[PDB]
């Protein structure tokens, strides 16, 4: 079967757009209308003229698109496409930190449930986390859920960061160790290292550039040979964007299972049956909308 043909005709007949993340399968990225990191996906979700949004990504990404487009239909092709790090942060975690630090603003990674965003003062992505926290008036900030990004933000802003929870992390990026850095410099001595801020601090210290996947794309021009310390599919995105550069994955087992829950087949089935509809309750969506919008205007 030619899934590509059927997906494109059905998408066009339903006035739908496909938004994919850089971690999506190569066959998914090839049919996507727009590809970017979480921040670029959020800003693209504010200029959607289509009636239907098919989100080739994880659940928190689709919910963010739904919060920014309550009048539109937002479809996620599989409800198992979830983010392990996002689900580590609970509402009770935030309430506990707000009781312990009443005058500290709550700054949440976009990788978070919609219910968690309802208690956040402003959201952040990997590309704008430092800029937003630096622009906050308070010197003590409640931050979550990713502990490794919190370390990078504390280093780059000089703020006192209260991490919530204590062990919040992404298992995909925590696979990278110092041994991978030493191996990369040995097998590619002329390459430079682009490392995601969700990696452990000791790995971040060895990086040439620390950035989100969007920041990796904007700064890939500074060199011609890169070892990429992030999810595996990002290397495909970089290789196709820059056919005359060299990119190597730091680990071939650094793949996100939740991201690969999206396939070409369930995208077709998503457009065929208008499923699965992403819904956010009004009270939760309204409070989260203010934090997401504040992020958009602060970055
Ligand atoms: O700026 C948006 C990036 C976003 O905050 N997150 C990520 C990594 C992720 O949490 O999947 C990326 O680099 O794409
Ligand atoms: S990669 Fe880590 S953070 Fe990005 S989605 Fe998969 S689990 Fe959540
Ligand atoms: Cl559009």
UniProtKB/Swiss-Prot annotation:
Where found? Cytoplasm
In its keyword annotation, does this UniProt entry include Cytoplasm? Answer: yes
What remark does the entry make about the cofactor?
Binds 1 [4Fe-4S] cluster per subunit.
Answer yes or no on keyword Magnesium. no
Molecular function (GO) terms for this protein are: 4 iron, 4 sulfur cluster binding; metal ion binding; quinolinate synthetase A activity
Per the record, the major location class is cytoplasm
Q: Which UniProt keywords apply?
A: 4Fe-4S, Cytoplasm, Iron, Iron-sulfur, Metal-binding, Pyridine nucleotide biosynthesis, Transferase
Chain residues that bind [4Fe-4S] cluster: 83, 170, 256
Give, as in the UniProt entry, the pathway in which the protein acts: Cofactor biosynthesis; NAD(+) biosynthesis; quinolinate from iminoaspartate: step 1/1
Q: Locate the residues binding iminosuccinate.
A: 21, 38, 109-111, 126, 196-198, 213
The record ties this protein, via Gene3D superfamilies, to: NadA-like (3.40.50.10800)
Catalytic reaction equation(s): iminosuccinate + dihydroxyacetone phosphate = quinolinate + phosphate + 2 H2O + H(+)
Outcome reported for the amino acid change (mutating residue 109 to F) = Loss of activity
What is any one GO biological process for this UniProt entry?
'de novo' NAD biosynthetic process from L-aspartate
Could you tell me what this protein does? Catalyzes the condensation of iminoaspartate with dihydroxyacetone phosphate to form quinolinate.
Family listed: Belongs to the quinolinate synthase family. Type 2 subfamily.
Question: Tell me, how does this one assemble?
Answer: Monomer. Homodimer.
What NCBIfam families does UniProt report for this protein, alphabetically? Answer: nadA, PRK09375.1-2
Regarding domains, what does the record say? Contains three domains displaying pseudo-three-fold symmetry that each contribute a cysteine residue for ligation to a centrally located [4Fe-4S] cluster.
Tell me the protein's name: Quinolinate synthase
């Amino acid at each position: 079967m030619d899934l590509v043909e059927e997906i494109l005709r059905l998408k066009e007949e339903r006035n739908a757009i496909i938004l994919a993340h850089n971690y999506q399968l190569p066959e998914v990225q090839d049919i996507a209308d727009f590809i970017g990191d979480s921040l670029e996906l959020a800003r693209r979700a504010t200029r959607v003229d289509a009636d239907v949004i098919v989100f080739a990504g994880v659940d928190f990404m689709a919910e963010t698109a739904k919060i920014l487009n309550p009048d539109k239909v937002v479809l996620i092709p599989s409800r198992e496409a979830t983010c392990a790090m996002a689900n580590m942060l609970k509402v009770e975690h935030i309430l506990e930190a707000k009781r312990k630090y009443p005058n500290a603003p709550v700054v949440l990674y976009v990788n978070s449930t919609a219910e968690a965003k309802a208690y956040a003062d402003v959201t952040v992505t990997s590309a704008n986390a430092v800029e937003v926290v630096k622009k906050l008036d308070s010197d003590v900030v409640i931050f979550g859920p990713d502990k490794n990004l919190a370390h990078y933000v504390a280093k780059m802003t000089g703020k006192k960061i209260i991490p919530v929870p204590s062990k919040g992390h992404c298992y995909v990026h925590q696979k990278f160790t110092l041994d991978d850095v030493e191996r990369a410099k040995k097998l590619h001595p002329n390459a430079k290292l682009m490392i995601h801020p969700q990696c452990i601090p000791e790995v971040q210290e060895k990086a040439d550039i620390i950035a989100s996947t969007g920041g990796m794309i904007k700064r890939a021009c500074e060199w011609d040979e890169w070892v990429v310390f992030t999810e595996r599919e990002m290397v495909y995105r970089l290789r196709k964007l820059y056919p005359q550069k060299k990119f190597y994955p730091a680990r071939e087992d650094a793949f996100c299972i939740g991201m690969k829950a999206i396939t070409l087949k369930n995208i077709y089935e998503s457009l065929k049956d208008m499923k699965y509809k992403v819904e956010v309750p009004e009270e939760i969506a309204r409070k989260a909308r203010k934090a997401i919008e504040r992020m958009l205007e602060m970055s």
